[PDB]
């Protein structure tokens, strides 16, 4: 009846396989936000991601193309 | 009366859960060349289970003081039974003072 | 080396997380890591005017958690 | 680690701690590990303005500890001398 | 039950916090029996108190005021009059000789006052060095040992909060003579602080009964189909554990010193040239360190003074709890204010049989010497008011079997030694303050 | 590694400025392979405060921004293991 | 070289560690000691230096000798100071710049 | 359908051109054929672009892994 | 490390991260620099609160200087 | 000297079954229930 624990290594795995567009916040930049698709990661969890457009506060949209996030920033990873 | 036995309640989250390292003394064997030998020692009367001493002199060691501080063997005639019995005195006098 | 975070507890409850940045985060927890890297799903974003914004399943690096809290009795 | 062997030896009472924001913390510490991840009950919390805030169950990450105020009853607390190998500090009786 | 180790248990405590005490040359030391009868018959005959201050499994040290009672038949007096005034029952089993009629007895009358059993199975290294059983039938022999403890248990109350199993942290694996004394949880620890991090509760609770590991696999499985896996205990625990009974005793120096230079436990080259029981002690003492083990199932599973005061009152107090005095008791107030409430179960004799002791509970208040209180007897009552005397109290001790620590005064929730209100007490007593509201009861 | 290069010279007088602006000018008693230096009789200047002397004094390590190292010491051979 | 796995020995981690300064990106303060080069250097504080570096560290930690030292703040004015040397802490170095001696 | 690592990543993208971005708002343009396992990273040719504006251009470049924020194109 | 130990039982004044100064009688320290002071005061801004005993984290401390010594034969022929 | 002396585990073995005949096979001390040393006290206190 109970629900099984989901480490968040194996979260981020599923959703590499999913494709699922992720919103990606930043550790101290409050405003700026990346958006992309997840096409990699290591134990340290850099994410490489898929077209990375930096949307702001105002939806200032900027495609980023192919870009690699180090691991150090990532304060938040959202599912869509 | 358990509803579910602790052993598949354990299992039955993460049935997946796992542990990388082995026990402290894998290589080993419980049981070495000398350790039955070294067992028998152990439960040994006095001076042979120790492995370590003091070199007593050779006339402060009995060698025979166990056969009187037991009971006499049965069926002995009566000038051993009395002999066992006096021996067993002298000890006993010496232990009280 | 590391030592495993004690928040058994706290799986499948409703949680309040503090970030970096006086950020705050609702959600039920549903999993944890070494570095205290939590797990996050039906979570609700608050901003600074306190406006509540659904946020999803989301997946905090421990790095910037300052707090876990919980309301319950 | 004598320092979080005192921590340990606070479990139970009411300690203060203040984290990285400035904000102060009263309450009760129930639990705390090696990282000094904490939890703690009844919580008063003064933020760095002044402003009260009551808390109920916190779970206070250690990497973002200032210090903290133990109760003064514990400044007898034993100092034990720790081995290369020990990771706790306890009484000792074999070599060293 | 008699000789069954419960002494040697809480010499294993006084090695650790009393360096100056060493072992005798000849027996054991039975710290704690303190008497030339006892001594000779070498077997407890009276029930000494002993408060000592431990460390738990993390570093938070406790004050342990645990109370040393005699495993003979004729002495129940003595597990039955100090039980009144503690919490719990810490039940020492010989796995060996197993449950008997006297540890039948004991958990009979300890479960039906309601009282939390913490289970040690003590004599462990006799299955490895003296029945030498494999460690399968070891493992068994055990099981067997904890399955009729919850037998006798269960003949009582079918209840599941009176359950000891060591899955719950409630059974303790224990050698006194080797000196180590430990649970599932102590050997999770054990392993994790070495090996890195793994919660050690999960790890700990999959650590029993026929759960077993699969060594390609590195998962517990549950039935492991013809021999894929061995037992989980069996595994981590028992095997390793008669891997070290067997190096230190089997001559092996170089395999030994290279095994504990693993573990960074260094000895000086003429340590491995001991006799094979002092070798067994230093590198028991050195691998198992303090037995935190026992002194955290001690704290987890048995009340503190405070949260058995409910209980205390309700069972043993049989006055009304709506009184003031009953909730003096209820809440264990400490301040001075309050009424001043003790139960005397027991006397002691000093050094010379002259004047006797009153082994005290304060179940609420405060007390000071030269403090006068009012002694209530066994039958007083409104219709008896005969039976109190008025009496006062010379000296405040806290005992410590060989020794006592003399206190100005004493606070609610601590078992103490009394001095001068002894005259009036035969067998129990009741002590209350004199400046106190009308109507006192007795326990 | 190069922090043996600072246990290496012991016993002269430095210039350090830390972490948070400040900046000490004394003597060093022993500096740490885990660079935890040891400072006697030095000079702490608190950035917008008001110098003051102190007998002596410890750095964390990673309080260290650089050094200012005097001129009279044999760099080339200082730097050989 | 073919072990970047980062699970090494002793022998192994030390030979990694030469060869990333053989051709890795901090090869560049190699080539800049044994031909003495100009590098300027940035620090966390917006602070300037420019110096010959006589050693390094594989921290980056450096020791630099005759470093020209400018920091920039009234009105913006720019200052200069020179050190004849210094022991800088890899920590707070935010980029390395080399100005080629030809 | 094939995921690529963030070391496979950059060693498969030696010698090309790249904008990394520092955690306080510079962005260098340059080609990069240097990085090791801390992914602290070298540049040839490199420029200083802030706010989006070529000032200055300063050559080869080493950059210490912390400091950057990404490193895309 | 030695010289760590000698600073035990001393009155030591801390300036930490933050600015603020602790000063007390040092009981215990840590491999991280956790320091252990016994009867502490605070030294913000300077104004004085008794804070009594205090754990100070290894990355809050900055400096730290004592202001204090530790406190405090047989027969012939 | 002679003073003091280490015997491996073999050489006690060995000491140990060479000079089988002459000791005792209890290892109990059950044995000598009334037949100790201090039940002879008793009994020559006792006149019995
Ligand atoms: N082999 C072995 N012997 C033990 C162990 N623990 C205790 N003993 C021995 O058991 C005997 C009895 O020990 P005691 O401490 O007197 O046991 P006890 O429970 O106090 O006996 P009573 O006070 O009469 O109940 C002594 O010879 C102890 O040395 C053990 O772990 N292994
Ligand atoms: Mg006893």
Redesign the interface.
């Known amino acids: 009846v109970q629900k099984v624990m989901i480490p968040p290594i194996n979260f981020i795995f599923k959703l590499l396989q999913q494709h699922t567009p992720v919103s990606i916040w930043l550790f101290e930049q409050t405003d700026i936000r990346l958006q992309g698709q997840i096409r990699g990661f290591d134990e340290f969890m850099n994410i490489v991601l898929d077209d990375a457009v930096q949307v702001d506060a105002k939806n200032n949209k900027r495609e980023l193309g192919r870009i690699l996030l180090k691991g150090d920033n990532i304060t938040l990873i959202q599912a869509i | ?2 509803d579910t036995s ?3 309640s ?16 894998h290589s ?8 039955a ?9 006095h ?9 007593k002199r050779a006339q402060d060691v009995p ?2 003081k ?1 056969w009187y ?3 006499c063997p049965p069926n002995q005639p009566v000038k051993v039974r009395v002999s066992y019995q006096k021996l ?1 005195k002298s000890h ?1 006098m010496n ?2 003072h | 080396k590391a030592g495993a975070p004690d928040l058994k507890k706290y799986l499948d409850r409703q949680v309040f997380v503090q970030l970096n940045g006086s950020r705050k985060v609702y959600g039920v927890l549903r999993g944890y890591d070494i570095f205290l890297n939590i797990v996050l799903e039906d979570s609700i974003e608050e901003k600074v005017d306190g406006e509540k914004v659904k946020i999803g399943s989301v997946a905090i690096r421990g790095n910037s958690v300052i707090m876990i809290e919980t309301l319950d009795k | 680690s004598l320092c979080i062997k005192l921590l340990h030896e606070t479990q139970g009472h009411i300690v203060t701690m203040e984290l990285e924001n400035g904000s102060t913390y009263r309450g009760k510490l129930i639990e705390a590990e090696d990282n000094m991840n904490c939890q703690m009950r009844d919580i008063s919390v003064t933020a760095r303005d002044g402003r009260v805030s009551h808390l109920d169950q916190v779970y206070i990450r250690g990497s973002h500890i200032r210090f903290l105020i133990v109760p003064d009853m514990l400044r007898n607390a034993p100092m034990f001398k720790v081995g290369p190998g020990r990771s706790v500090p306890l009484p000792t009786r074999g070599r060293r | 039950h008699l000789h069954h180790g419960k002494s040697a248990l809480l010499d294993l405590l006084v090695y650790y916090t009393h360096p100056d005490t060493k072992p005798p040359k000849r027996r054991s030391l039975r710290y704690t029996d303190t008497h030339y009868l006892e001594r000779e018959r070498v077997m407890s005959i009276k029930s000494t108190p002993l408060t000592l201050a431990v460390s738990d499994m993390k570093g938070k040290t406790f004050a342990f005021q645990c109370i040393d009672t005699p495993g003979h038949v004729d002495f129940v007096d003595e597990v039955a009059a100090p039980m009144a005034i503690s919490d719990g029952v810490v039940l020492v089993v010989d796995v060996i000789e197993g449950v008997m009629i006297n540890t039948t007895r004991i958990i009979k009358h300890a479960i039906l006052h309601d009282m939390p059993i913490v289970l040690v199975l003590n004599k462990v290294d006799r299955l490895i060095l003296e029945l030498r059983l494999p460690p399968n039938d070891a493992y068994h022999k055990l099981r067997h040992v904890i399955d009729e403890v919850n037998d006798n248990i269960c003949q009582i109350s079918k209840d599941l909060k009176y359950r000891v199993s060591p899955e719950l942290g409630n059974v303790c694996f224990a050698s006194c003579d080797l000196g180590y004394c430990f649970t599932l949880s102590s050997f999770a620890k054990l392993y994790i602080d070495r090996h890195g991090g793994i919660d050690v509760d999960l790890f700990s609770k999959r650590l029993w009964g026929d759960i077993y590991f699969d060594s390609k696999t590195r998962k517990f499985a549950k039935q492991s189909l013809d021999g894929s896996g061995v037992r989980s205990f069996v595994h981590f625990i028992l095997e390793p554990l008669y891997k070290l009974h067997t190096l230190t005793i089997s001559d092996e120096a170089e395999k030994l010193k290279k095994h504990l230079s693993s573990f960074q436990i260094y000895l000086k080259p003429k340590d491995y040239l001991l006799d094979p029981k002092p070798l067994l002690q230093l590198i028991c003492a050195s691998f198992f360190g303090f037995p935190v083990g026992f002194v955290n199932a001690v704290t987890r599973h048995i009340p503190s003074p405070r949260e058995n005061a409910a209980r205390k009152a309700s069972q043993s107090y049989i006055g009304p709890i709506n009184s003031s005095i009953g909730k003096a008791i209820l809440e264990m107030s400490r301040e001075e204010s309050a009424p001043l409430v003790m139960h005397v179960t027991k006397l002691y004799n000093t050094v010379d049989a002259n004047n006797f002791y009153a082994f005290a509970r304060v179940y609420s208040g405060q007390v000071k010497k030269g403090q006068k209180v009012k002694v209530l007897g066994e039958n007083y009552s409104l219709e008896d008011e005969e039976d109190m005397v008025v009496a006062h109290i010379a000296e405040i001790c806290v005992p410590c079997a060989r020794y006592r620590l003399h206190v100005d005064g004493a606070v609610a929730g601590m078992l103490v030694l009394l001095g001068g209100v002894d005259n009036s007490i035969s067998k129990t007593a009741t002590i209350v303050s004199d400046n106190l509201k009308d109507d006192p009861y007795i326990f | 590694k190069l922090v043996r290069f600072l246990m290496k010279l012991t016993n002269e007088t430095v210039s350090i400025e830390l972490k948070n602006g400040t900046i000490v000018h004394g003597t060093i008693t022993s500096v740490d392979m885990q660079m935890n230096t040891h400072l006697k009789a030095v000079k702490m200047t608190v950035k917008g405060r008001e110098p003051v002397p102190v007998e002596t004094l410890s750095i964390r390590g990673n309080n260290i921004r650089y050094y200012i190292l005097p001129d009279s010491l044999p760099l080339d051979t200082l730097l050989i293991d | 070289v073919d072990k970047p796995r980062s699970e090494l020995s002793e022998i192994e981690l030390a030979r990694l560690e030469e060869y990333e300064f053989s051709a890795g990106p901090l090869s560049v303060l190699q080539q800049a000691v044994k031909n003495h080069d100009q590098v300027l250097i940035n620090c966390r504080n917006n602070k300037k230096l420019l110096a010959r570096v006589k050693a390094f560290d594989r921290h980056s930690n450096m020791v630099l000798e005759n470093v020209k030292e400018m920091w920039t703040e009234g009105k913006a004015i720019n200052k200069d100071r020179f050190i004849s040397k210094m022991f800088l802490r890899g920590d707070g170095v935010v980029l390395v710049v080399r100005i080629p001696s030809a | 359908f094939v995921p690529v690592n963030p070391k496979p990543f950059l060693q498969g993208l030696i010698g090309k051109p790249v904008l990394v971005r520092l955690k306080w708002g510079q962005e260098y343009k340059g080609t990069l054929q240097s990085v090791d396992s801390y992914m602290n990273l070298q540049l040839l040719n490199a420029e200083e672009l802030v706010d989006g504006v070529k000032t200055g251009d300063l050559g080869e470049i080493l950059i210490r892994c912390n400091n950057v924020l990404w490193v895309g194109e | 490390t030695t010289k760590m130990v000698s600073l035990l039982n001393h009155s030591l004044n801390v300036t930490t991260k933050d600015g603020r100064t602790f000063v007390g009688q040092l009981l215990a320290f840590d491999g991280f620099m956790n320091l252990v002071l016994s009867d502490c005061q605070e030294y913000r801004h300077e104004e004085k609160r008794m804070l009594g005993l205090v754990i100070l984290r290894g990355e809050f401390i900055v400096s730290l200087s004592v202001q204090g010594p530790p406190p405090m034969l047989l027969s012939g022929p | 000297t002679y003073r003091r002396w280490k015997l491996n585990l073999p050489q006690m073995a060995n000491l140990h079954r060479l000079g089988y005949q002459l000791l005792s096979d209890l290892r109990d001390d059950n044995y000598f229930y009334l037949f100790n040393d201090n039940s002879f006290f008793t009994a020559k206190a006792l006149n019995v």
């Open positions: 009366e358990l602790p052993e598949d354990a299992i039955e989250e993460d049935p997946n859960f796992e542990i990388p390292f082995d026990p402290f003394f080993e064997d419980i049981e070495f060349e000398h350790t030998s070294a067992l028998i020692l152990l439960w040994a009367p001076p042979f289970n120790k492995r370590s001493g003091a070199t060698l025979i166990h501080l037991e009971h067993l006993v232990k009280l």
